[PDB]
């Protein structure tokens, strides 16, 4: 009954979503959905747009299965001047916060656009503010948006290109339930699922031996290690990562191996130090990537990303073996 993905708008935002008028936001939505399909392998559901007149005139909401996941203001006659961290001074206008990243921002008249840019502000128009927020929410909720129906539709599409591979695999070797869970686990850590041949071929080799979607996910991630490596370290420059202090690594390994647990305070400090390492990577311009021993990757991914979803936790078995790695930050 409820649309998988929906948007509600006050009356001032109707033009940017009206195919008979300017409809600028409709074209941005299409590019967002196309870019997710091509880059992540995940065609998001259509965004059902409807007017809502008890909403403020310049207000929009974004909803998933009828549950609001985001909202904000967009003023068609104004630009949003966003301070990325380097802007200088202030501008007159409605002070706010950019909906995607939480950065300080100001809605400004058109006549201040260039002045704001000279002051180092990133200046975007109203429809782009909404699009950016939607694009961010689709990314944040990619796994939740990829339900069983979505998994079936994708399997049906790939079946057209790879009929024999898909026939030998589902449902006799891996069920849709298991395939959906593995694909969801990949999307949950921002791993693209566009390379369905490698994914299905890997499941075909290991599903007969391991029915656990958790273990399949680890083996699929290794099979996709080149795509994962190029996602966070595109090109051929030095791979700059966070690493664990050597002593910490062994304390965690021996805790999972029944050799003695770590005091709870050490876990809290582990989390605090991961946040500090993230801030350092950001300051260095390096990726938000923590590289760890294969045996630790699922644990630390779940433990740390619960509080720090921006963190990427990779296994040493996933990182392309021809890359030069440098630990630019150390946790512990």
Residue numbers in the entry: 359 to 690
Can you quote the paper on this entry?
FliD and FliC are found in complex with their dedicated chaperones FliT and FliS, respectively, in the cytoplasm. Here we report the structures of the ternary complexes among the FliD and FliC flagellar proteins, their cognate chaperones FliT and FliS, and the export gate protein FlhAC. FlhAC folds in a clamp-like structure with four discrete subdomains (d1 through d4).
The globular cytoplasmic domain of Salmonella enterica serovar Typhimurium FlhA (FlhAC) encompasses residues 362–692 (36.4 kDa) and is tethered to the transmembrane domain via a linker (residues 328–362). We determined the crystal structure of FlhAC at 1.9 Å resolution, which shows high similarity to a previously reported structure solved at 2.8 Å resolution of a longer FlhAC construct that includes the linker (FlhAC−link)26. Multiangle light scattering (MALS) data showed that FlhAC is monomeric in solution whereas the linker in FlhAC−link promotes a dimeric state that, based on the crystal structure, is mediated almost exclusively by electrostatic contacts. Indeed, FlhAC oligomerization is very sensitive to the salt concentration in solution. The cleft is hydrophobic and is lined by aliphatic and aromatic residues, as well as several Thr residues. The binding cleft is the most conserved surface in FlhAC highlighting the importance of this region to the function of FlhA.
